[PDB]
């Protein structure tokens, strides 16, 4: 409030806070429907209740007309007094509406009703405030819209009237102020106006409100469908193709005219109209662009390139006109006019550039516009009328048929059919009970297209993919508790049990088994959660052995093996085991007949057939005890001697050393052959250097420190052992000069006691603003006479304590979900360096444990159950990021190690931070090259693995890799749906997978906003908690006036010091939120934030036993935490918003400060909800005849939906959240 102005009701703040705790008491004393009564009785029996109730008559309204004014002043931030009056009347209307049904309507009103109204109608009031703060002019026109709009106050109708005022302003001011600004204004109003139009926002609205909502929806349709024109076409057609710019401005208004009478695009009438305007503009401008109108050349029937205006005046492309340019005849197919053979054809570039340039640009803008129209047509809750969908899906063909990329034109045709999923997904977004007929018609006319090839297993695996995506992102991942029923409901669709109904059944069974798979494959040791995962498991049990179809179990085995690996599935079925239920195989007897060797895949097989032969030769030499053949096998093969040594060492590990793993000591390598092989390492001249020879001899006789008597309990020290032995070979036999730091991290890791380990957190305040400045007595001041807020120093914003640490800086791997890096490195390369350092330290923690104990700076007890469980997490993250199966991820690790090895072409100490950075960026140039070669090298690996003698007999080794029809004479093969391609396992799509595609398909210059969102998405979902830790950080400051001695230091005692349990329960629910946000973000604060925190502070997790000096946002000591956390959250939010102040390109400063902060100004986006289904939806799949479906994410559309739903604009500045005692 300004100067000389007072509260409308005396002591207005204490009354509000007293009522807002009586309300909290009434919350837990009763249930949801008990509040409206119990709150009134509680405030009626209180002494203030009789203090006010004695007052009677019109004085009542006086007080009320004052109170609900000040309430707004104490809850919102009214820019002007007119907005205050509007909010006053809106809240008064809400209060009267609540009092309408109160068992005492309009008898006497009371103060609690205002709080009840605000609490119930909070979203609508705050959306009204947002509308009147996006553009203030709305209120001005709304000022006379009380005589103009007769306002009878019985329900909250003011928001809809404001929406109409705003939308009429939009209609009457189209394109006026530099249409870019009009575009940004409509995009800023997109959220509030859609919420007003949204049905689940005006639940209790009346007849007048429903009518005005209808009308505002009607205008918003045309404003927003036109809006996108203005975006793709006008704004952009001509940034590039200019002549058209003003030309396009001609038709935009016409577009509104076409939608002026009716704007319900999901209807026959209006839709057949937009289509028409658009076609017309296209044609008209094509004509203008050229003297005669531009059309593709005859024979090519493609476009036009390097043409010439012949006497025929037909720009025909050269190399297509080669039929006449090679046979030496001089007519074009269109005209057939011929001047004699003497003239020489050439190229007219000025015309050529125009034709080619116009074609590409015209086709792009129009496609974007059409796509955006189908997605305002396919919006609300029901599919468009039959004619609309019929015209849409019938538009995919040319009658080169069906090569149309969902365009209303007829000029662009790609090639032989390319069936896409653009139309199927927007049609399948609804339930599979109203779009069944449409899809069955679509596929039935799809197979009649051009005699579709008989090999139809890559088309059904497109429809099944699209059905699975829709099921999984429509109702499978939206709920929070309904899963408890969904897991039962799917169980029902296991008791009772190619067209679209059958395809939907197949896809739903595939997803049911997919969920049963990761219910069936979770680490044992926490056995619990019996009801759900056992009733569902028994339902799957009866389904599988009741249907009698042995394909579902094949899919189960495939999914299990792609989730955990081959060895887990193999060990899941061994006769008589107690953990064994032999469900998913129908092959147990056949595998049990071949039980001598359960099966072990030589994952070192990514070397060629050379290692394949060497391992066989070594095994033969060992089993016959005559190893002289090795001495010629080394001569038989031909590679550089370093690779010879590496292959030999790996052969000893794979055939000799690994045998010291079987608990059955009888199968251990008998000393008879061990003596001979040790001797022949002695006479081996390839292993001439001492260290390699010693390592080989240690490997043979089982004296390598890594393979010690006690490894980890299970095959977690089995794959990691393989990777570590491969690293041993590459470091011992490798000759590259940048492998030395990894060598010294192993092999006496005591020299590497003062070195910066690669891929470790750095002090971000060292390389490089709005951040806090330090006063002379070390206090972080506000944004930057002016003096420091605390200690009052003569400084103010209006040294080189680099927090970097050496060694293994990060701590407990159990809290680790997404990799975040720096130094401009891809996360894939960054992890595969953080996995080769842990693969060069785990082996290092075998010669001297204590030396590494001095390297892991958060000291541990055993650096061998630490690093192995760290590498397990690294592999789990790598699997999610790449999307491959577990075995293929171990394979890609091995392939990266090979690339390091087969590379025969800056410090050896890693003493300085910049030197570690240089080593990172120089090894990234060798790891990356054959990391993009995973679409061809991995199939080669899989072939060589499921081709070798060792496993090309195991039943399960053929189900996973080969085709089960060959060896199982029990699979039902009668239909196309029973081919071993439909039941294969696809790659699950996750947010981390998209973070790899975005940075592979270059996204640091093509989708900057999506990249800045994904690469910081791990700790960005915590920004939505800001309006909660900015509430208890301001409810304490108010409570804690200047006492200058806060002696107590236990949050538990504070939580127990409050009486009236409900209030301490609320404080508990808020403190838990703060503690969860701190514990899940503390590690990044100490090396990423700007408020220098003491290094001990972000070391251990916090809980309800720490000091109470944490919560208070003090500028020194224990209170520096609750300031650093809020500052980091604000920094993340404003960094994203600034990244949005990009391509939108126009400055926009809403600039809410950190005391008005509410739920609206923060990026509020739970990951399973909007984020996951949105990414699943935009994943589109294209199948070309004779080619498998290709996953294709649309990055631009994902970015646009991200920025137009969460990141529109809402900036923030830190100026409070402080002990203003």
């Amino acid at each position: 409030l300004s100067e000389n102005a007072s509260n409308n009701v005396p002591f207005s703040w204490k009354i509000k806070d007293y009522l807002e705790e009586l309300w909290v008491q009434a919350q837990y004393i009763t249930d949801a429907e008990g509040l409206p009564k119990k709150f009134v009785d509680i405030f009626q029996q209180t002494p203030l209740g009789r203090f006010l109730a004695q007052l009677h008559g019109e004085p009542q309204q006086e007080l009320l007309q004052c109170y609900l004014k000040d309430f707004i002043l104490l809850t919102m931030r009214v820019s002007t007094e007119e907005e205050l009056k509007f909010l006053q009347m809106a809240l008064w209307s809400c209060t009267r509406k609540l009092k309408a049904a109160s068992e005492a309507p309009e008898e006497e009103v009371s103060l609690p009703w205002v709080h009840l109204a605000y609490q119930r109608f909070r979203s609508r009031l705050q959306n009204f405030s947002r509308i009147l703060t996006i553009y203030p002019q709305v209120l001005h026109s709304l000022m006379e819209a009380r005589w103009n709009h007769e306002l009878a106050g019985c329900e909250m109708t003011l928001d809809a009237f404001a929406a109409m005022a705003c939308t009429e302003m939009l209609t009457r001011n189209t394109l006026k102020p530099s249409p870019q600004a009009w575009l940004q204004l409509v995009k800023n109003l997109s959220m509030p106006l859609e919420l007003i139009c949204s049905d689940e926002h005006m639940q209790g609205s009346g007849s007048l409100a429903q009518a005005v909502i209808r009308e505002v929806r009607a205008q918003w349709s045309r404003i927003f469908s036109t809006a996108l024109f203005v975006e793709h076409v006008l704004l952009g057609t001509e940034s590039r193709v200019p002549e058209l710019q003003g030309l396009v401005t001609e038709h935009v208004f016409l577009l509104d005219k076409c939608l002026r009478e009716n704007s319900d695009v999901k209807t026959h009438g209006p839709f057949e109209a937009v289509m028409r305007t658009l076609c017309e503009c296209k044609e008209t401008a094509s004509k203008t662009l050229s003297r005669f109108g531009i059309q593709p050349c005859s024979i090519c029937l493609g476009d036009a390139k390097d043409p010439v205006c012949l006497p025929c005046d037909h720009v025909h492309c050269l190399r297509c006109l080669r039929a006449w340019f090679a046979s030496e005849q001089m007519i074009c197919p269109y005209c057939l006019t011929a001047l004699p053979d003497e003239f020489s054809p050439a190229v007219s570039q000025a015309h050529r550039e125009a034709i080619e340039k116009h074609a590409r640009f015209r086709q792009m803008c129009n496609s974007f516009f059409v796509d955006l129209v189908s997605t305002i047509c396919f919006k609300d809750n029901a599919p468009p009328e039959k004619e609309v969908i019929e015209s849409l899906l019938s538009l995919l063909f040319v009658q080169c048929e069906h090569t149309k990329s969902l365009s209303p034109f007829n000029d662009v045709v790609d090639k032989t059919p390319v069936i896409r999923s653009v139309i199927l997904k927007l049609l399948l977004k609804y339930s599979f009970h109203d779009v069944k007929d449409y899809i069955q018609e679509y596929l039935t006319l799809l197979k009649k297209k051009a005699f579709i090839t008989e090999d139809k297993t890559e088309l059904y695996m497109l429809f099944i993919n699209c059905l699975e995506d829709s099921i999984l992102e429509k109702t499978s991942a939206y709920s929070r508790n309904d899963e408890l029923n969904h897991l039962e409901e799917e169980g029902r669709f296991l008791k009772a049990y190619a067209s679209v109904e059958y395809l939907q059944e197949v896809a739903r069974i595939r997803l049911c088994l997919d969920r049963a798979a990761d219910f069936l494959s979770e680490p044992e040791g926490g056995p619990e959660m019996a009801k759900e995962k056992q009733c569902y498991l028994q339902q799957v049990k009866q389904f599988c052995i009741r249907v009698e179809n042995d394909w579902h179990r094949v899919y189960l085995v495939r999914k299990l093996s792609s989730q955990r690996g081959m060895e887990f599935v193999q060990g899941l079925s061994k006769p008589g085991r107690p953990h064994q239920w032999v469900f998913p195989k129908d092959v147990v007897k056949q595998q049990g007949l071949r039980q001598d060797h359960p099966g072990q895949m030589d994952r070192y097989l990514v070397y060629g057939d050379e290692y394949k032969a060497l391992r066989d030769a070594v095994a033969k030499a060992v089993l016959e005890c005559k190893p002289l053949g090795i001495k010629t096998a080394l001569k038989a093969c031909k590679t550089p001697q370093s690779q010879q040594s590496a292959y030999f060492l790996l052969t000893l590990f794979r055939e000799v050393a690994i045998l010291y793993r079987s608990h059955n000591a009888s199968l251990h390598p008998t000393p008879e052959q061990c003596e001979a092989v040790s001797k022949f390492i002695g006479e081996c001249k390839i292993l001439s250097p001492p260290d390699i020879s010693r390592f080989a001899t240690s490997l043979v006789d089982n004296s390598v420190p890594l393979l010690r008597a006690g490894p980890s309990d299970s095959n977690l020290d089995g794959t990691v052992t393989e990777m570590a032995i491969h690293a041993a070979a590459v470091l011992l036999c490798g000759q590259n000069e940048l492998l030395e730091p990894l060598k010294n991290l192993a092999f006496s890791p005591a020299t590497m006691a003062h070195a910066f380990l690669p891929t470790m957190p750095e002090d971000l305040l060292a390389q490089a603003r709005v951040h806090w400045y330090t006063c002379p007595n070390g206090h972080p001041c506000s944004v930057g006479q002016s003096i420091c807020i605390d200690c009052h120093a003569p400084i103010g914003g209006i040294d080189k304590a680099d927090r970097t640490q050496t060694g293994h800086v990060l701590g407990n791997p159990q809290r680790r979900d997404v990799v975040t890096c720096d130094r401009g490195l891809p996360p894939v390369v960054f992890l595969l360096i953080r996995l080769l350092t842990h693969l060069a330290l785990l082996l290092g923690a075998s010669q001297s444990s204590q030396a590494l104990i001095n390297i892991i700076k958060p000291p541990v007890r055993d650096p061998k159950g630490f690093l192995q469980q760290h590498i397990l997490k690294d592999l789990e993250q790598l699997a999610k990021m790449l999307g491959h199966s577990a075995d293929e991820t171990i394979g890609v690790v091995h392939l990266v190690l090979r690339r390091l090895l087969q590379e025969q072409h800056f410090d050896t100490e890693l003493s300085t931070k910049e030197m570690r950075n240089n080593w990172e960026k120089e090894i990234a140039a060798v790891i990356s090259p054959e990391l993009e070669h995973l679409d061809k090298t991995l199939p080669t690996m899989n072939n060589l693995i499921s081709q070798d003698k060792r496993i090309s007999s195991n039943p399960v080794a053929k189900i996973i890799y080969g085709d089960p029809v060959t060896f199982l004479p029990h699979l039902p093969r009668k239909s196309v749906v029973h081919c071993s391609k439909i039941w294969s396992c696809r790659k699950r799509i996750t947010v981390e997978y998209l973070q790899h595609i975005v940075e592979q398909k270059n996204g640091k210059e093509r989708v900057p906003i999506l990249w800045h969102f994904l690469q910081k998405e791990a700790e960005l979902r915590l920004v939505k908690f800001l309006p909660e830790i900015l509430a208890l950080q301001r409810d304490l400051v108010k409570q804690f006036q200047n006492v200058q001695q806060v002696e107590y230091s236990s949050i538990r005692g504070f939580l127990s010091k409050h009486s009236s349990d409900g209030l301490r329960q609320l404080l508990h629910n808020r403190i838990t939120v703060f503690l969860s946000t701190w514990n899940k973000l503390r590690r990044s604060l100490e090396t990423n934030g700007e408020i220098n925190l003491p290094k001990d502070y972000c070391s251990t997790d916090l809980d309800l036993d720490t000091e109470f000096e944490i919560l208070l946002p003090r500028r020194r000591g224990l209170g520096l935490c609750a300031t650093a956390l809020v500052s980091y959250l604000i920094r993340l939010h404003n960094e994203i918003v600034y990244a949005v102040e990009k391509l939108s390109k126009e400055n926009n400063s809403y600039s809410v400060d950190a005391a008005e902060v509410t739920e609206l100004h923060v990026i509020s986006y739970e990951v399973e909800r909007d984020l996951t289904p949105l990414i699943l939806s935009n994943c589109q799949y294209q199948v070309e005849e004779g080619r498998e479906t290709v996953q294709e994410f649309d990055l631009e559309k994902i970015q646009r939906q991200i920025v137009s739903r969460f990141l529109q604009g809402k900036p923030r500045l830190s100026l409070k959240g402080i002990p203003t005692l």
Partner: protein, 235 residues
């Protein structure tokens, strides 16, 4: 020269939009009528309509204009050059006529073809059907149309153009054929007479969905050691 003709042409010139160069056309009409010139040239004058034409003209050159309909054609006319117009239909064709070039138009149907027609160019049009070809016709151009079928060809026909159409079957080609333009259609087979054309004849059937039996037969015939037929391009 004629008073009624000059009055009509003056009214037509005075009844023209600013975009049309009706003064030049008016003067040229006066010159042609006064001297009884055989050729009337009104091409590239941005004319939208035409007045009564001189009756003695034998060649009408009205290409590259904005004409949508044509007036009555003089009976002594022989050659028409009306390409690159907005014509939707054509009037009755004179019997003495021999030549049409009505390409790049918006016509949907053609009138009766004269008995003395020699060359036909109606390419880049909206024709859904063709009239019966005159026996003396030598060249027909129907490229870029919507034709579902083509009438039987005369025995004196030498050149054929039908690319970018919807024709399903080809009638037997006369031996006088020396150049067949047949790409971009829905043809599944070719008539056997295409193998009996002259060795120097040119045929291209690229983009046609020819069946397997068809391409096997064509490969057997054309690659034979004694093959003497025309060169057929499939690409």
């Amino acid at each position: 020269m004629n008073e009624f003709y000059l009055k009509t042409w003056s009214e037509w010139e005075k009844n023209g939009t600013p975009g049309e160069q009706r003064n030049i056309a008016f003067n040229r009409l006066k010159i042609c009528l006064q001297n009884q010139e055989a050729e009337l040239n009104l091409s590239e004058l941005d004319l939208k309509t035409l007045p009564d034409l001189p009756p003695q003209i034998t060649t009408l050159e009205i290409r590259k204009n904005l004409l949508t309909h044509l007036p009555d054609l003089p009976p002594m006319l022989k050659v028409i050059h009306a390409q690159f117009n907005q014509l939707e239909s054509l009037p009755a064709l004179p019997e003495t006529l021999e030549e049409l070039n009505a390409g790049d138009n918006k016509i949907k149907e053609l009138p009766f073809l004269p008995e003395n027609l020699t060359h036909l160019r109606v390419h880049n049009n909206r024709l859904h059907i063709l009239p019966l070809l005159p026996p003396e016709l030598k060249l027909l151009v129907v490229s870029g149309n919507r034709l579902d079928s083509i009438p039987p060809f005369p025995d004196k026909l030498e050149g054929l153009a039908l690319a970018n159409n919807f024709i399903e079957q080809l009638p037997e080609l006369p031996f006088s054929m020396n150049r067949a333009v047949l790409m971009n259609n829905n043809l599944t087979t070719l008539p056997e007479s295409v193998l009996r054309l002259a060795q120097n004849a040119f045929v291209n059937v690229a983009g046609n969905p020819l069946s397997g039996h068809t391409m096997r037969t064509l490969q057997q015939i054309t690659t034979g050691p004694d093959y003497s037929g025309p060169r057929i391009f499939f690409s």
